[PDB]
Amino acid sequence: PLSVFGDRSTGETIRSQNVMAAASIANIVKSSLGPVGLDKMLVDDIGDVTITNDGATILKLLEVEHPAAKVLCELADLQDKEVGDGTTSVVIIAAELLKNADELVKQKIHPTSVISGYRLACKEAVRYINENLIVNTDELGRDCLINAAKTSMSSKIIGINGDFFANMVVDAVLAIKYTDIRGQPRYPVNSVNILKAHGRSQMESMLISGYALNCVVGSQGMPKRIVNAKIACLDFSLQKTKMKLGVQVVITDPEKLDQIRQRESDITKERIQKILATGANVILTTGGIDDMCLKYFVEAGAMAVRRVLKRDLKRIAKASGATILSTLANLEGEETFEAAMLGQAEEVVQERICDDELILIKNTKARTSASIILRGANDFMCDEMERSLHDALCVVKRVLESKSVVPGGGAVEAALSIYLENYATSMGSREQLAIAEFARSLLVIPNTLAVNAAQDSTDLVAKLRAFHNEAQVNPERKNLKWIGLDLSNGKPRDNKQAGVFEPTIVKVKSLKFATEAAITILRIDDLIKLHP
């Protein structure tokens, strides 16, 4: 009677299907949570291999068909984009929330009441985290940043070398620090150029006190090391000058053809002489350089690098004081190149890294930059190091911008579960069930960590809940809020003094995004799939 060209699923069928899809996406990444989590290996059915532990990467590489599964995948992607860490915890929490909500709906609780309960629970959990479980980082010091980085590096290919990589990450982030108007310190991560090169072990990774280019000098005749570099950044190609499409050369007297042809390259010769007459030593350009201009630079004993990436050139110019020049045209309609627009660096070298060469711009003036050269056993390991390093850099940035961190190891979520279960008995009649299920679903993460450690999940979670219940009930036992999970020995541990931290924004954004995704999926009770 309806006569729609497609397939229709109504009622409990589609809801159970959505829960199945979300649970499958959760189980895909559930085995890769916490310090005892293990990495996964992916094949792109052509031979490409990607060894990874990052949840966002795993979910992005997979090709998925179901729409709710897609919702969870983009949820992990959004968590990665907006926070940088916790891309697996958010997915796990969202799937558990959806599963418990579906159970409530199957118990004939209307989904609107479930959604209202989830909304109230998320608001109350965020408020409780903000006013009870945050730890100000000003009274902890650089150890706080180091511990936050180490915690972000656990369950990564660089987890054991945390004592070294956390120092690297903290130093780099402190190096790229800058302040804006109204005096707000800002940390533009992704300006730390991460260069990978297989070879020596992980401990041989270098933190460059400058900038690192994945480029080489244009000609073998140029020097490979300049001491007091005067960098000139350019945004135009140094080639033979060809007139544009609207200009056409037509010769009626042969005597002028030779002069035309001479000028055709003498123009670029004059421009390069103007560049080099100011004392420039290193010339970086985004455009190409042909052999004649390469020789012009060689004879003068300077450096010239072609095909420099735009972002690299912008970073170098900002960190050295140079200014990008699209053209050598001043405000009087002339070709000039003043010395004021030359950037300076303490040294520019061409190092050799495992049979390949890269250009180092060391100790730039007027601004401190940083880059990291990662050495690994092979390409896959280097990629995994880079991904883990990006996670750690983002975590340190979050900690430095907003100066609040929360205990790790499932302490915050056990506390939230206890508080929410207690608080649900306050208002509502059917919303209390939804809030209680929110609290119950919040416990999926400590359960997952315990399962990954092959420990007694039931007993450990029971002990953790008992500790947090005692902390809430007893005024004088408030120091038990920090009791988290020690995965090495399988016993609860005070994670605030054990050095396990994570930015508060990670937990808050994770909760908000997971609640939003669960609400979005929960509204569906009908699917119409038209034929293609």
Binding site: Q107, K108, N447, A450, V451, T458, D459
Partner: protein, 528 residues
């Protein structure tokens, strides 16, 4: 994985191992339970299963529905097996067992997911089941008076409760009275084969009747049958297993004669053999002749000439029922046809029912058997009526064996859940979670009743839990009144053995499913 030049098992073998396998098993059990979920309670509905040949099977019985589903999941087959087991031992509760087992599995699914050892869960199920069965035996209600009136009322109430979920629920009083009478008319073994059930198309449900005797369809009358009188007022019945027709003396017999006089003597001898058999039957004093073996046209006309009634090719079971009702003895030889071996009924009649001719043997005073004659508008209608009557008959037989009852409507399981929760609150705590899960899983049946009836199951369950907690053992679901009520005073009675066996079988199925960790499927041979 590696190619492994020579592989261990046969190529194509499928193996699943670990927690995911157990979780998938639980999900499969859930799927199987869902297929029979809505067929529980006075508001339960029917299912229509079409087989490959096109036949439809419309039924409410859980065991029937599960059988007609060609389930092949190894873990899901256990639920079908326990449904068949409950049908065999008890005869009712085949829907409750599957729901209970699936709910046990669903309740312990989260604990399995977090890596709980299956042995602990199995021990918890066994302990909870033992305690629940003991509690059922302790709180079951029985009367030590053996009063005939009260026993009859108890049987009728149990039958009504058993029937108050089928398409004949509107006529549950009538059928309950008929079923109780039929069961009480059985002597000492309560053999099912002594309660015949005949289905005749056409007619209202109330047209169906119980015959205090035996009735069966007319069986291929020969020529001259329409001459025999079709009513007798004190017949003597000659129950026979004899072929009364002209035929070869023996399969390997051969007659060799060499004179026409001997030829004629042989022909007359065959005729005299048949006539001597018929003469012995006639002089036995009987007026109704029933034979398991064919009765030929010659014997039919012979009996018509004597105002006698004959019916050959009577089915063997119907002959046994006739012997049990009238009280004769099936004779393979017509020689010693003494009055001892002749049946006797008050009235024999050959009436028409719905386009069919049925022979009726009414007025048997010491009959030890019955015969239901069911009427309906379709063959599936009558088949489902017979299934419901079978449920009622088995319940009444069990109640005859022991008259111990508990209130239905989920009251018994709410009481058991309260008891189990109270017990579980007094143990160290790892077993406490699992016994509490068992107690919560016991609440499926009242919740399913409310969901099928269209109530709000949450409010009803809250009211039931509060009522049981403060006192009142037999408070269950009141379907008609949109509320809860004391089901014992509502005459919602069930034999205690039904819940006892349901709990036992559900616990066994749950333990068996939980214990299995690895499933291995060898490649199937002869695939065509």
């Amino acid at each position: 994985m590696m190619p492994t030049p020579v592989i261990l098992l046969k190529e194509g073998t499928d193996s699943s191992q670990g927690i995911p396998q157990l979780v998938s098993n639980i999900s499969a059990c859930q799927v199987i339970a869902e297929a029979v979920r809505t067929t529980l309670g006075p508001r339960g509905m029917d299912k229509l299963i079409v087989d490959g040949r096109g036949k439809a099977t419309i039924s409410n019985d859980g065991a029937t529905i599960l059988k007609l589903l060609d389930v092949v999941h190894p873990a899901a087959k256990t639920l079908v097996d326990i449904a068949k087991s409950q049908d065999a031992e008890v005869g009712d509760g085949t829907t409750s067992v599957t729901l209970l087992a699936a709910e046990f599995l669903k309740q312990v699914k989260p604990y399995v997911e977090e890596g709980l050892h299956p042995q602990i869960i199995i021990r918890a199920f066994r302990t909870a089941t033992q305690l629940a069965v003991n509690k059922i035996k302790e709180i079951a209600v029985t009367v030590k008076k053996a009063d005939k009136v009260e026993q009859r009322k108890l049987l009728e109430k149990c039958a009504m409760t058993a029937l108050s979920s089928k398409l004949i629920s509107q006529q549950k009083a009538f059928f309950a009275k008929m079923v109780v009478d039929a069961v009480m008319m059985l002597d000492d073994l309560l053999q099912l084969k002594m309660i015949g059930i005949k289905k005749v198309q056409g007619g209202a449900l109330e047209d169906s009747q119980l015959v205090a005797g035996v009735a069966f369809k007319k069986t291929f009358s020969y020529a001259g049958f329409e001459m025999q009188p079709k009513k007798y007022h004190n017949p003597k019945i000659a129950l026979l297993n004899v072929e009364l027709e002209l035929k070869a003396e023996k399969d390997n017999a051969e007659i060799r004669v060499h004179t026409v006089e001997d030829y004629q003597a042989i022909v007359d001898a065959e005729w005299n053999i048949l006539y001597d058999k018929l003469e012995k039957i006639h002089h036995s004093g009987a007026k109704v002749v029933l034979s398991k073996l064919p009765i030929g046209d010659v014997a039919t006309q012979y009996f018509a000439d004597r105002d006698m009634f004959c019916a050959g090719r009577v089915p063997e079971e119907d002959l046994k029922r006739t012997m049990m009702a009238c009280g004769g003895s099936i004779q393979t030889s017509v020689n010693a046809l003494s009055a001892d071996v002749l049946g006797r009924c008050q009235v024999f009649e050959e009436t028409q029912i719905g386009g069919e001719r049925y022979n009726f043997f009414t007025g048997c005073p010491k009959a030890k058997t019955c015969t239901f004659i069911l009427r309906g508008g379709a063959e599936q209608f009558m088949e489902e009526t017979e299934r419901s009557l079978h449920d009622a008959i088995m319940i009444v037989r069990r109640a005859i064996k022991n008259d111990s009852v508990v209130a239905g409507g989920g009251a018994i399981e709410m009481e058991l859940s309260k008891y189990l929760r109270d017990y579980s609150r007094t143990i160290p705590g790892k077993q406490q979670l699992l016994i509490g899960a068992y107690a919560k899983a016991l609440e499926i049946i009242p919740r399913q009743l409310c969901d099928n009836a269209g109530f709000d199951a949450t409010n009803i369950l809250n009211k039931l839990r509060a009522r049981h907690a403060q006192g009142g053992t037999w408070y269950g679901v009141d379907i008609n009144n949109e509320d809860i009520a004391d089901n014992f005073e509502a005459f919602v009675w069930e034999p205690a053995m039904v819940r006892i066996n349901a709990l036992t079988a559900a616990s066994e199925a749950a333990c068996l499913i939980v214990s299995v960790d690895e499933t291995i499927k060898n490649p199937r041979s002869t695939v065509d």
